Amino acid sequence: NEVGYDDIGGCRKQLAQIKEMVELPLRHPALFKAIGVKPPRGILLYGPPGTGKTLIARAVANETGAFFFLINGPEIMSKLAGESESNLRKAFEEAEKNAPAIIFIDELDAIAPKREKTHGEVERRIVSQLLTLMDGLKQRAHVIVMAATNRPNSIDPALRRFGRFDREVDIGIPDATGRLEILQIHTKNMKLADDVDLEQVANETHGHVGADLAALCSEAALQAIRKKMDLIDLAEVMNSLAVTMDDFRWALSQSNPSALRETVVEVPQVTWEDIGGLEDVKRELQELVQYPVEHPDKFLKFGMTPSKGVLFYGPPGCGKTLLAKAIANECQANFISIKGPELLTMWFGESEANVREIFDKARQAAPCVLFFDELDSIAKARGGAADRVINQILTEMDGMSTKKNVFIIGATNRPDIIDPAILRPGRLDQLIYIPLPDEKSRVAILKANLRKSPVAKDVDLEFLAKMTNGFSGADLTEICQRACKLAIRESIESEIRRERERDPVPEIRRDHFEEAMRFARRSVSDNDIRKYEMFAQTLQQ
């Protein structure tokens, strides 16, 4: 036993939560009379698999100094019939006499799956044996258990019956800083050529696993092996560990992550400078999520509970999406975004428990903001009514208190045919129309265009911002892509003349901007803007 905190760390919030929730037998054995009962009587761990949850349990039992005693879960499935209760009853009786015991089983879906998966008799008998051993461990000298599950829907809800397995602590995936921590710890073994800071690697990667970052580190060292020709039993590499930034980018091009397409949960990094204008609107969207978190006395002063979200109907654009990202960044709260295709999956695909799973993820990862987009798509597809999604949405938000403040940010192209029921109070009625973005917002968009972009003189960004009033900010990012395409068309094409004969000029100029402002279009028409301003008739009841 040689593990530590930092090995599979990075997820500092969840590891700090499990630090606060597990340390109660550590140094405080008689405190259970003061607290009344231990909140750990079994701790469930759902997430994308293989994220070092087993090493998380090993690390927390190392820091408590308790008898860890890992039991491999599918070994019970690997035992023969009639003796499958061995190494579980024996393990629990071993942990009964050893009072500092933090039990960790793993792959509980092998042991205790969904009720549809429980065909056969020995599997449900193993399930019953484990849960009866668990509630037999009532207090029983401060012994707890930990599990390793995919998601709570895939396991037996009889184990999720409370009084046992009541703690759900959602390790999930790390952020760019957490992936930087995992990448730094896994590169403690190796040595790099210092041509990369590895924050660009951890920021560039998306949806990976800590074991997948171990695979990236292994493939970078493998590329260091692959570059050199086969030395005759040589330690010429063992003193010259020289993995490069080229090795890391080629490893990133090769690797296929596993936790891809799972819904991300963590706070994003926008820091409010992408957006501009709508100062009372941005103050309102700041306050509705921040002051429930930062000033509970102010909503304790007046007990009238504010709404738990908005509806950003308006023109199609990424400004509402980046605004909703920066809201959770400035609140420093978690963020889950469920866009249009995922909403269409419940109507085309017909799995309406997914809405329950998304809101359960939102509740379990509180404080959080649920961003929703393209909500009219399931209704405009019907046109050319709620249809299993919107009624599910109203079902979940009705069962949603102001405590565990899940925030619901909608985004809609057309407010006419979305839902009559969302306009009523008690539901989510905040018709915050963000307009087509004006000149200050487009200057902020141009400032965001400078991010990860070498910039110099000669560019007339103010002239383009003055011309493109009707062109939206998402469309201004589109013409930034067009000008980038025109620059990339001629950058290395300039120096390929040198190689054809035998400077990169890494700056976009104004002629590329003029060609890009010739080529494109605009993503709005005025006959949509008039029905956007149709809601300005809201004067008097």
Q: Which of 3, 70, 198, 421 binds a copy of itself (CB under 8 A)?
A: 421
Task: Answer for the pair 93, 69: CB distance below 8 angstroms, yes or no.
Answer: no
| Contacting a copy of itself within 431-470 (CB under 8 A) | 452-454, 468
**CB of residue 381 vs a copy of itself: minimum separation in angstroms?**
5
Q: Which of 69, 395, 440, 443 binds a copy of itself (CB under 8 A)?
A: 395
> ∠ at Cα 539 (533, 541), nearest 5°?
130
| Contacting a copy of itself within 4-43 (CB under 8 A) | 20, 24, 27-28, 31, 33-39
* Residue 166 near a copy of itself by CB under 8 A: yes
Q: How many CB atoms lie within 10 A of CB 163?
A: 10
**CB of residue 22 vs a copy of itself: minimum separation in angstroms?**
12
**CB of residue 218 vs a copy of itself: minimum separation in angstroms?**
5
Using a 10 angstrom Cβ sphere, with 0-12 exposed, 13-18 middle and 19 or more buried, the burial of residue 192 is buried
**CB of residue 67 vs a copy of itself: minimum separation in angstroms?**
21
Q: Which of 86, 189, 271, 332 binds a copy of itself (CB under 8 A)?
A: 189
| Contacting a copy of itself within 270-329 (CB under 8 A) | 283-284, 287, 291, 295-296, 298-304, 306-307, 316, 318
* Residue 131 near a copy of itself by CB under 8 A: yes
The three-state secondary structure class of 125 is: helix
**CB of residue 23 vs a copy of itself: minimum separation in angstroms?**
10
CB-based contacts of 416-423 (< 8 A; 24+ apart in sequence): 416/531, 417/376, 417/379, 417/380, 417/383, 418/313, 418/375, 418/376, 418/379, 418/390, 419/375, 419/379, 419/386, 419/390, 421/386, 421/390, 421/394, 422/311, 422/390, 422/394
**CB of residue 489 vs a copy of itself: minimum separation in angstroms?**
6
Q: Provide the pairing of β-strand 167-168 with 43-44.
A: parallel
**CB of residue 178 vs a copy of itself: minimum separation in angstroms?**
18
**CB of residue 396 vs a copy of itself: minimum separation in angstroms?**
8
DSSP result, 482-538: HHHHHHHHHHHHHHHHHHHH--------HHHHHHHHHH---S--HHHHHHHGGGGG-
* Residue 523 near a copy of itself by CB under 8 A: yes
DSSP result, 273-300: -S----HHHHHHHHHHHHHHHH-TTHHH
Q: Which residues contact 176 (CB under 8 A, 6 or more apart)?
A: 199, 202, 203, 269
CA distance 169 to 331: 21
* Residue 65 near a copy of itself by CB under 8 A: no
Size of the site for a copy of itself (CB under 8 A): 168
**How far is CA 243 from each of CA 179, 238, 357, 363, 440, rounded to the nearest angstrom?**
18, 12, 42, 42, 44
Task: Answer for the pair 409, 372: CB distance below 8 angstroms, yes or no.
Answer: yes
| Contacting a copy of itself within 347-376 (CB under 8 A) | 348-349, 352, 363-364, 366, 374
Which residue shows structure tokens 């979305």?
418
What is the per-residue binding string for a copy of itself in 227-266, x denoting contact by CB under 8 A? ------x---xx--x----x--x--xxxxxxx-xx-----
Nearer to a copy of itself, 311 or 476 (CB): 476
Q: Which of 474, 512, 513, 532 binds a copy of itself (CB under 8 A)?
A: 474
* Residue 401 near a copy of itself by CB under 8 A: yes
| Contacting a copy of itself within 193-222 (CB under 8 A) | 204, 206-207, 209, 211-212, 214-215, 217-219, 221-222
Stretch that binds a copy of itself, among 3-11, 62-70, 175-183, 423-431 (CB under 8 A): 423-431
Task: Answer for the pair 377, 387: CB distance below 8 angstroms, yes or no.
Answer: no
Which residue shows structure tokens 């700056």?
507
| Contacting a copy of itself within 90-109 (CB under 8 A) | 107
* Residue 381 near a copy of itself by CB under 8 A: yes
Stretch that binds a copy of itself, among 78-86, 139-147, 270-278, 525-533 (CB under 8 A): 78-86
* Residue 472 near a copy of itself by CB under 8 A: yes
Task: Answer for the pair 112, 159: CB distance below 8 angstroms, yes or no.
Answer: yes
Q: Which residues are known binding-site members?
A: 49-55, 150, 186, 317-322
* Residue 61 near a copy of itself by CB under 8 A: no
Residue at 497: amino acid letter: R
Task: Answer for the pair 453, 356: CB distance below 8 angstroms, yes or no.
Answer: no
* Residue 78 near a copy of itself by CB under 8 A: yes
**CB of residue 275 vs a copy of itself: minimum separation in angstroms?**
16
**CB of residue 492 vs a copy of itself: minimum separation in angstroms?**
7
Task: Answer for the pair 324, 409: CB distance below 8 angstroms, yes or no.
Answer: yes
Q: Which of 16, 65, 114, 163 binds a copy of itself (CB under 8 A)?
A: 163
Q: Which residues are known binding-site members for ATP?
A: 49-55, 150, 186, 317-322
Task: Answer for the pair 42, 142: CB distance below 8 angstroms, yes or no.
Answer: no
- For the chain, how many helices (H) and strands (E)? 23, 8
* Residue 496 near a copy of itself by CB under 8 A: no
